[PDB]
């Protein structure tokens, strides 16, 4: 009887198991560490006897992924596009769209300029997807202490000064709030430097997270669109920001937004409606109200990245696509 | 002469004893630990010479379970349904309904899609029931310290930070208030993380329990209805919440509800009456007054789970069944 | 010359001594420990040469029990009833009624469904009676420390937290006030848990005793009437409680009752008069004034148990028998 949940469990029918699943999942963990910077816990492989082909992924033993692979399913494609179509189903919890392809169709898709997974990889490229939706749960206080104890090899004075500046719970909160926005924390040295520089002059951890986001803005803007080509930007017009700035209320532990449910909701469906025009769009708002806006749209729209004007340097052009704007609701709609 | 009561004693006539009772009770304890997360103390088996077939379950040597199995009783069914009927009796203390079945009738019931216990299992499936009604008594201060000392293997910094945040009595109070609502505490890591994040900004342990309940809401909503099918929700109309919000009185150790016995009582019989329409219903109220409402209906209706609006995510639909509503009583009924 | 009185001395004529008195008294001590939870000190047997058959029981060397067994006395019955009668005498200090029976009459009484003591047991069943009248003197500060040092085997953190909460004299006071009401303290774990939960928010030890009584209310209601059959309840009407609530006066060390001797006395004889209708009755009053009422009737009526409304759960019915009520006296009788 040992307390503490088992962190990561992958349950598979013995048909799906193979000899290269171990090293494939190992390489998946290594790649995810190099990309997002959060060291994932080693996976526990459980063989579940079942005639029906099914796999499940268990985070802390709460079933969060469950999928049944069809019989003809041997080549896997993540996401859907116009060039290749056929046998597509939507992942649960709104994680997206996937397709199963035959040998020839998948060869054509691979030739078209995409990646096609076949064999044990079909597990990894699925498992990885799940991890990208639940990454923020693998960085807490103990994981933060592990990162700091690993960084005490080369940066001993940096870690010591940081500890003298901020207690470990605030560091863990900042790292978690960074990771839950798909901002990589591989560059821990710069993060610790920014928290040290901006720690004496600030007390709400959320502002520290904003500052660490700004100091990483080069990395963020590279990881969004790797090539220098301009990808679209959806500005928010001054109405919504001017609305939300009066929602800022300050207590001894920070500043929080207080908007009526009507304003929140209408913002959510209007943003959702305006995002159907193109597959990938980047929302943009002001610096002072970026975080608050994320806090009013993180629950439903998770994959959409909410940048800020200062987080885009003057070396990046804007390629404006739309202009979202609303006035208040309770006093009068005036835009809605 | 050794002080301290004997925790768990099962007294049986020598007829009921067997060779597989030891490992059966062991597996029962293991399953209950994996389900609810509270490590139960090892059971003491006492053989009670009695011609009459009778068993008793003793928590701290205060007889709390006493049942006499009939002579023809060899196959056991927990709960009653329309498909199978015959030889049904109600467990004491309002623990429910059970049936004893013959070999053929129990085979038919098992084929119908239920579980039938026969042999030593008839003890376990009964004993377990008792444990599910008294679980909250097996988590105190010493048990909390045992859990923390077990979690000091992998999460040392998490436990140290928690201790620096909250004294052990508040942690034990929070865990007990969680377990006495059938909220599993198997995921201790997330519980400690939430208590660490929300401990500096809060002093009434009951609010901390509310926050830990919210952070577990995915688990709670899975454990209530394991399948994604919508199961019924009984809302409470705004009258009762608007009534009870003025019952909140704040002292230096927290906020408590103060309602006249008339309001409490009328709420209890009206809820009890409205719950006879369906076997299983989930009450729903507001976030601010969930706990208080539980505190005014925990004594009589224990098995009914009282969720909250925020504890249900926007990814779960509502399947409204009824709408409970009352006004005040002392000033004027106005609904009653 | 050694300070400190000899705790328990039983003085007997050599006629009454036997070879099985040692183990009989040992089993008596063990049973009393399992029942009331207070570990009694080992008895010192003194042989007192006397032609007259007489025994004495000495608590701290102050003669408190003295009885002379008649010549024809070989079978002993404790208490008197209608079915068997003959050779009955009243124990001193109002401890009750006993009977000596011949072989055939005692056999008939045993067949009637009672217990009959013969031989060395006639000492034990008498000695035990004395112990049940003076139990509260065997739990002080040293005995409390012995109980806590025994409970430091399995509950180390529970005892440590309790000590950090309450000094040992308050714990001893609470245990003594519990034992002097025939409330068993065998379940020390729950008592310590309740004192830990309710210690920060309270300073008068008497309230802590009330809370520990409430948390034990299951044990208490079982030990009063072991079977689920309803046994009578004598309510007190609102007059006396409404009278006594203004007697509550609060000093820096707690709240005490201050009533004129007339009110006290009249309450005592009226209760005594109303209790002659039935052999066994349970007084009931409000939660706020139970303890005070006991404090105004403990001196004369000791054996009568004074429960409280909250100490009876809603699962127990009331079987009201009478309704005691009085108004004030000094201002005007108005009921008396």
PDB file of N, CA, C and O in Angstrom, chain B residues 125-173:
ATOM      1  N   UNK B 125     -18.122  -8.459   0.511  1.00  0.00           N
ATOM      2  CA  UNK B 125     -19.050  -7.527  -0.116  1.00  0.00           C
ATOM      3  C   UNK B 125     -20.007  -6.922   0.898  1.00  0.00           C
ATOM      4  O   UNK B 125     -20.629  -5.891   0.623  1.00  0.00           O
ATOM      5  N   UNK B 126     -20.147  -7.546   2.068  1.00  0.00           N
ATOM      6  CA  UNK B 126     -20.890  -6.908   3.145  1.00  0.00           C
ATOM      7  C   UNK B 126     -19.982  -5.990   3.951  1.00  0.00           C
ATOM      8  O   UNK B 126     -20.297  -4.809   4.147  1.00  0.00           O
ATOM      9  N   UNK B 127     -18.831  -6.510   4.388  1.00  0.00           N
ATOM     10  CA  UNK B 127     -17.900  -5.710   5.174  1.00  0.00           C
ATOM     11  C   UNK B 127     -17.546  -4.421   4.449  1.00  0.00           C
ATOM     12  O   UNK B 127     -17.607  -3.330   5.029  1.00  0.00           O
ATOM     13  N   UNK B 128     -17.213  -4.529   3.160  1.00  0.00           N
ATOM     14  CA  UNK B 128     -16.878  -3.356   2.365  1.00  0.00           C
ATOM     15  C   UNK B 128     -17.979  -2.309   2.444  1.00  0.00           C
ATOM     16  O   UNK B 128     -17.704  -1.121   2.648  1.00  0.00           O
ATOM     17  N   UNK B 129     -19.239  -2.741   2.337  1.00  0.00           N
ATOM     18  CA  UNK B 129     -20.346  -1.798   2.451  1.00  0.00           C
ATOM     19  C   UNK B 129     -20.237  -0.993   3.736  1.00  0.00           C
ATOM     20  O   UNK B 129     -20.268   0.244   3.714  1.00  0.00           O
ATOM     21  N   UNK B 130     -20.037  -1.683   4.863  1.00  0.00           N
ATOM     22  CA  UNK B 130     -19.897  -0.993   6.142  1.00  0.00           C
ATOM     23  C   UNK B 130     -18.761   0.016   6.077  1.00  0.00           C
ATOM     24  O   UNK B 130     -18.908   1.167   6.509  1.00  0.00           O
ATOM     25  N   UNK B 131     -17.623  -0.388   5.513  1.00  0.00           N
ATOM     26  CA  UNK B 131     -16.494   0.526   5.431  1.00  0.00           C
ATOM     27  C   UNK B 131     -16.838   1.758   4.610  1.00  0.00           C
ATOM     28  O   UNK B 131     -16.412   2.864   4.954  1.00  0.00           O
ATOM     29  N   UNK B 132     -17.625   1.601   3.543  1.00  0.00           N
ATOM     30  CA  UNK B 132     -17.995   2.763   2.744  1.00  0.00           C
ATOM     31  C   UNK B 132     -18.898   3.728   3.494  1.00  0.00           C
ATOM     32  O   UNK B 132     -19.053   4.874   3.059  1.00  0.00           O
ATOM     33  N   UNK B 133     -19.496   3.299   4.605  1.00  0.00           N
ATOM     34  CA  UNK B 133     -20.360   4.198   5.357  1.00  0.00           C
ATOM     35  C   UNK B 133     -19.610   4.872   6.499  1.00  0.00           C
ATOM     36  O   UNK B 133     -20.045   5.920   6.990  1.00  0.00           O
ATOM     37  N   UNK B 134     -18.478   4.312   6.912  1.00  0.00           N
ATOM     38  CA  UNK B 134     -17.661   4.857   7.988  1.00  0.00           C
ATOM     39  C   UNK B 134     -16.229   5.212   7.610  1.00  0.00           C
ATOM     40  O   UNK B 134     -15.314   5.120   8.430  1.00  0.00           O
ATOM     41  N   UNK B 135     -16.008   5.604   6.356  1.00  0.00           N
ATOM     42  CA  UNK B 135     -14.644   5.794   5.878  1.00  0.00           C
ATOM     43  C   UNK B 135     -13.987   6.978   6.570  1.00  0.00           C
ATOM     44  O   UNK B 135     -12.800   6.928   6.915  1.00  0.00           O
ATOM     45  N   UNK B 136     -14.756   8.038   6.819  1.00  0.00           N
ATOM     46  CA  UNK B 136     -14.218   9.275   7.358  1.00  0.00           C
ATOM     47  C   UNK B 136     -13.603   9.148   8.733  1.00  0.00           C
ATOM     48  O   UNK B 136     -12.947  10.092   9.187  1.00  0.00           O
ATOM     49  N   UNK B 137     -13.796   8.020   9.405  1.00  0.00           N
ATOM     50  CA  UNK B 137     -13.211   7.806  10.717  1.00  0.00           C
ATOM     51  C   UNK B 137     -11.827   7.180  10.653  1.00  0.00           C
ATOM     52  O   UNK B 137     -11.174   7.066  11.693  1.00  0.00           O
ATOM     53  N   UNK B 138     -11.363   6.772   9.473  1.00  0.00           N
ATOM     54  CA  UNK B 138     -10.052   6.151   9.342  1.00  0.00           C
ATOM     55  C   UNK B 138      -8.989   7.116   8.850  1.00  0.00           C
ATOM     56  O   UNK B 138      -7.903   6.678   8.459  1.00  0.00           O
ATOM     57  N   UNK B 139      -9.269   8.417   8.852  1.00  0.00           N
ATOM     58  CA  UNK B 139      -8.296   9.435   8.478  1.00  0.00           C
ATOM     59  C   UNK B 139      -8.329  10.524   9.551  1.00  0.00           C
ATOM     60  O   UNK B 139      -9.272  11.319   9.632  1.00  0.00           O
ATOM     61  N   UNK B 140      -7.328  10.518  10.423  1.00  0.00           N
ATOM     62  CA  UNK B 140      -7.218  11.510  11.472  1.00  0.00           C
ATOM     63  C   UNK B 140      -5.901  12.247  11.378  1.00  0.00           C
ATOM     64  O   UNK B 140      -5.460  12.580  10.276  1.00  0.00           O
ATOM     65  N   UNK B 141      -5.252  12.495  12.516  1.00  0.00           N
ATOM     66  CA  UNK B 141      -3.965  13.180  12.491  1.00  0.00           C
ATOM     67  C   UNK B 141      -2.833  12.174  12.327  1.00  0.00           C
ATOM     68  O   UNK B 141      -1.876  12.404  11.579  1.00  0.00           O
ATOM     69  N   UNK B 142      -2.932  11.035  13.011  1.00  0.00           N
ATOM     70  CA  UNK B 142      -1.893  10.018  12.886  1.00  0.00           C
ATOM     71  C   UNK B 142      -1.886   9.400  11.495  1.00  0.00           C
ATOM     72  O   UNK B 142      -0.817   9.169  10.919  1.00  0.00           O
ATOM     73  N   UNK B 143      -3.064   9.127  10.932  1.00  0.00           N
ATOM     74  CA  UNK B 143      -3.114   8.591   9.575  1.00  0.00           C
ATOM     75  C   UNK B 143      -2.592   9.603   8.564  1.00  0.00           C
ATOM     76  O   UNK B 143      -1.909   9.231   7.604  1.00  0.00           O
ATOM     77  N   UNK B 144      -2.907  10.886   8.757  1.00  0.00           N
ATOM     78  CA  UNK B 144      -2.361  11.916   7.882  1.00  0.00           C
ATOM     79  C   UNK B 144      -0.842  11.953   7.964  1.00  0.00           C
ATOM     80  O   UNK B 144      -0.160  12.093   6.941  1.00  0.00           O
ATOM     81  N   UNK B 145      -0.291  11.822   9.171  1.00  0.00           N
ATOM     82  CA  UNK B 145       1.162  11.804   9.301  1.00  0.00           C
ATOM     83  C   UNK B 145       1.751  10.566   8.641  1.00  0.00           C
ATOM     84  O   UNK B 145       2.841  10.623   8.063  1.00  0.00           O
ATOM     85  N   UNK B 146       1.039   9.440   8.689  1.00  0.00           N
ATOM     86  CA  UNK B 146       1.530   8.258   7.988  1.00  0.00           C
ATOM     87  C   UNK B 146       1.544   8.481   6.482  1.00  0.00           C
ATOM     88  O   UNK B 146       2.500   8.100   5.797  1.00  0.00           O
ATOM     89  N   UNK B 147       0.494   9.108   5.947  1.00  0.00           N
ATOM     90  CA  UNK B 147       0.464   9.397   4.517  1.00  0.00           C
ATOM     91  C   UNK B 147       1.598  10.333   4.125  1.00  0.00           C
ATOM     92  O   UNK B 147       2.253  10.133   3.097  1.00  0.00           O
ATOM     93  N   UNK B 148       1.851  11.359   4.936  1.00  0.00           N
ATOM     94  CA  UNK B 148       2.917  12.302   4.616  1.00  0.00           C
ATOM     95  C   UNK B 148       4.291  11.647   4.722  1.00  0.00           C
ATOM     96  O   UNK B 148       5.183  11.931   3.913  1.00  0.00           O
ATOM     97  N   UNK B 149       4.476  10.744   5.688  1.00  0.00           N
ATOM     98  CA  UNK B 149       5.757  10.057   5.809  1.00  0.00           C
ATOM     99  C   UNK B 149       5.950   9.042   4.690  1.00  0.00           C
ATOM    100  O   UNK B 149       7.088   8.706   4.343  1.00  0.00           O
ATOM    101  N   UNK B 150       4.857   8.531   4.125  1.00  0.00           N
ATOM    102  CA  UNK B 150       4.984   7.668   2.954  1.00  0.00           C
ATOM    103  C   UNK B 150       5.296   8.487   1.710  1.00  0.00           C
ATOM    104  O   UNK B 150       6.071   8.057   0.850  1.00  0.00           O
ATOM    105  N   UNK B 151       4.695   9.670   1.600  1.00  0.00           N
ATOM    106  CA  UNK B 151       4.950  10.553   0.471  1.00  0.00           C
ATOM    107  C   UNK B 151       6.279  11.290   0.583  1.00  0.00           C
ATOM    108  O   UNK B 151       6.677  11.961  -0.374  1.00  0.00           O
ATOM    109  N   UNK B 152       6.981  11.180   1.709  1.00  0.00           N
ATOM    110  CA  UNK B 152       8.318  11.758   1.785  1.00  0.00           C
ATOM    111  C   UNK B 152       9.377  10.935   1.067  1.00  0.00           C
ATOM    112  O   UNK B 152      10.568  11.229   1.214  1.00  0.00           O
ATOM    113  N   UNK B 153       8.987   9.910   0.309  1.00  0.00           N
ATOM    114  CA  UNK B 153       9.970   9.145  -0.452  1.00  0.00           C
ATOM    115  C   UNK B 153      10.295   9.834  -1.769  1.00  0.00           C
ATOM    116  O   UNK B 153      11.468  10.032  -2.105  1.00  0.00           O
ATOM    117  N   UNK B 154       9.268  10.204  -2.532  1.00  0.00           N
ATOM    118  CA  UNK B 154       9.449  10.790  -3.850  1.00  0.00           C
ATOM    119  C   UNK B 154       9.174  12.283  -3.901  1.00  0.00           C
ATOM    120  O   UNK B 154       9.680  12.952  -4.806  1.00  0.00           O
ATOM    121  N   UNK B 155       8.396  12.822  -2.970  1.00  0.00           N
ATOM    122  CA  UNK B 155       7.968  14.215  -3.030  1.00  0.00           C
ATOM    123  C   UNK B 155       8.492  15.099  -1.904  1.00  0.00           C
ATOM    124  O   UNK B 155       7.837  16.046  -1.474  1.00  0.00           O
ATOM    125  N   UNK B 156       9.695  14.785  -1.416  1.00  0.00           N
ATOM    126  CA  UNK B 156      10.195  15.341  -0.161  1.00  0.00           C
ATOM    127  C   UNK B 156       9.980  16.846  -0.084  1.00  0.00           C
ATOM    128  O   UNK B 156       9.538  17.367   0.947  1.00  0.00           O
ATOM    129  N   UNK B 157      10.274  17.566  -1.167  1.00  0.00           N
ATOM    130  CA  UNK B 157      10.130  19.015  -1.130  1.00  0.00           C
ATOM    131  C   UNK B 157       8.664  19.421  -1.072  1.00  0.00           C
ATOM    132  O   UNK B 157       8.318  20.424  -0.441  1.00  0.00           O
ATOM    133  N   UNK B 158       7.788  18.648  -1.711  1.00  0.00           N
ATOM    134  CA  UNK B 158       6.363  18.954  -1.661  1.00  0.00           C
ATOM    135  C   UNK B 158       5.837  18.861  -0.237  1.00  0.00           C
ATOM    136  O   UNK B 158       5.154  19.774   0.246  1.00  0.00           O
ATOM    137  N   UNK B 159       6.185  17.784   0.465  1.00  0.00           N
ATOM    138  CA  UNK B 159       5.754  17.608   1.846  1.00  0.00           C
ATOM    139  C   UNK B 159       6.374  18.671   2.745  1.00  0.00           C
ATOM    140  O   UNK B 159       5.706  19.209   3.636  1.00  0.00           O
ATOM    141  N   UNK B 160       7.659  18.981   2.544  1.00  0.00           N
ATOM    142  CA  UNK B 160       8.302  19.996   3.375  1.00  0.00           C
ATOM    143  C   UNK B 160       7.647  21.360   3.195  1.00  0.00           C
ATOM    144  O   UNK B 160       7.379  22.062   4.178  1.00  0.00           O
ATOM    145  N   UNK B 161       7.377  21.751   1.950  1.00  0.00           N
ATOM    146  CA  UNK B 161       6.708  23.021   1.712  1.00  0.00           C
ATOM    147  C   UNK B 161       5.312  23.028   2.317  1.00  0.00           C
ATOM    148  O   UNK B 161       4.890  24.029   2.907  1.00  0.00           O
ATOM    149  N   UNK B 162       4.581  21.918   2.192  1.00  0.00           N
ATOM    150  CA  UNK B 162       3.252  21.854   2.788  1.00  0.00           C
ATOM    151  C   UNK B 162       3.314  22.028   4.300  1.00  0.00           C
ATOM    152  O   UNK B 162       2.546  22.810   4.872  1.00  0.00           O
ATOM    153  N   UNK B 163       4.221  21.309   4.966  1.00  0.00           N
ATOM    154  CA  UNK B 163       4.371  21.461   6.411  1.00  0.00           C
ATOM    155  C   UNK B 163       4.717  22.895   6.777  1.00  0.00           C
ATOM    156  O   UNK B 163       4.194  23.434   7.757  1.00  0.00           O
ATOM    157  N   UNK B 164       5.602  23.527   6.005  1.00  0.00           N
ATOM    158  CA  UNK B 164       5.908  24.931   6.251  1.00  0.00           C
ATOM    159  C   UNK B 164       4.679  25.810   6.055  1.00  0.00           C
ATOM    160  O   UNK B 164       4.580  26.884   6.660  1.00  0.00           O
ATOM    161  N   UNK B 165       3.723  25.367   5.238  1.00  0.00           N
ATOM    162  CA  UNK B 165       2.513  26.147   4.999  1.00  0.00           C
ATOM    163  C   UNK B 165       1.428  25.904   6.042  1.00  0.00           C
ATOM    164  O   UNK B 165       0.911  26.862   6.624  1.00  0.00           O
ATOM    165  N   UNK B 166       1.067  24.649   6.291  1.00  0.00           N
ATOM    166  CA  UNK B 166      -0.054  24.312   7.153  1.00  0.00           C
ATOM    167  C   UNK B 166       0.369  23.339   8.242  1.00  0.00           C
ATOM    168  O   UNK B 166       1.103  22.383   7.977  1.00  0.00           O
ATOM    169  N   UNK B 167      -0.080  23.555   9.473  1.00  0.00           N
ATOM    170  CA  UNK B 167       0.146  22.564  10.526  1.00  0.00           C
ATOM    171  C   UNK B 167      -0.648  21.295  10.260  1.00  0.00           C
ATOM    172  O   UNK B 167      -1.671  21.300   9.574  1.00  0.00           O
ATOM    173  N   UNK B 168      -0.152  20.191  10.824  1.00  0.00           N
ATOM    174  CA  UNK B 168      -0.657  18.872  10.451  1.00  0.00           C
ATOM    175  C   UNK B 168      -2.133  18.712  10.790  1.00  0.00           C
ATOM    176  O   UNK B 168      -2.846  17.944  10.133  1.00  0.00           O
ATOM    177  N   UNK B 169      -2.630  19.434  11.796  1.00  0.00           N
ATOM    178  CA  UNK B 169      -4.038  19.284  12.151  1.00  0.00           C
ATOM    179  C   UNK B 169      -4.949  19.851  11.068  1.00  0.00           C
ATOM    180  O   UNK B 169      -6.013  19.289  10.789  1.00  0.00           O
ATOM    181  N   UNK B 170      -4.536  20.942  10.417  1.00  0.00           N
ATOM    182  CA  UNK B 170      -5.343  21.490   9.328  1.00  0.00           C
ATOM    183  C   UNK B 170      -5.313  20.581   8.106  1.00  0.00           C
ATOM    184  O   UNK B 170      -6.332  20.411   7.426  1.00  0.00           O
ATOM    185  N   UNK B 171      -4.158  19.981   7.815  1.00  0.00           N
ATOM    186  CA  UNK B 171      -4.080  19.011   6.727  1.00  0.00           C
ATOM    187  C   UNK B 171      -5.002  17.834   7.005  1.00  0.00           C
ATOM    188  O   UNK B 171      -5.729  17.371   6.116  1.00  0.00           O
ATOM    189  N   UNK B 172      -4.978  17.323   8.238  1.00  0.00           N
ATOM    190  CA  UNK B 172      -5.829  16.190   8.585  1.00  0.00           C
ATOM    191  C   UNK B 172      -7.300  16.560   8.505  1.00  0.00           C
ATOM    192  O   UNK B 172      -8.121  15.764   8.042  1.00  0.00           O
ATOM    193  N   UNK B 173      -7.652  17.766   8.950  1.00  0.00           N
ATOM    194  CA  UNK B 173      -9.032  18.221   8.837  1.00  0.00           C
ATOM    195  C   UNK B 173      -9.472  18.287   7.382  1.00  0.00           C
ATOM    196  O   UNK B 173     -10.584  17.866   7.042  1.00  0.00           O
TER     197      UNK B 173
END
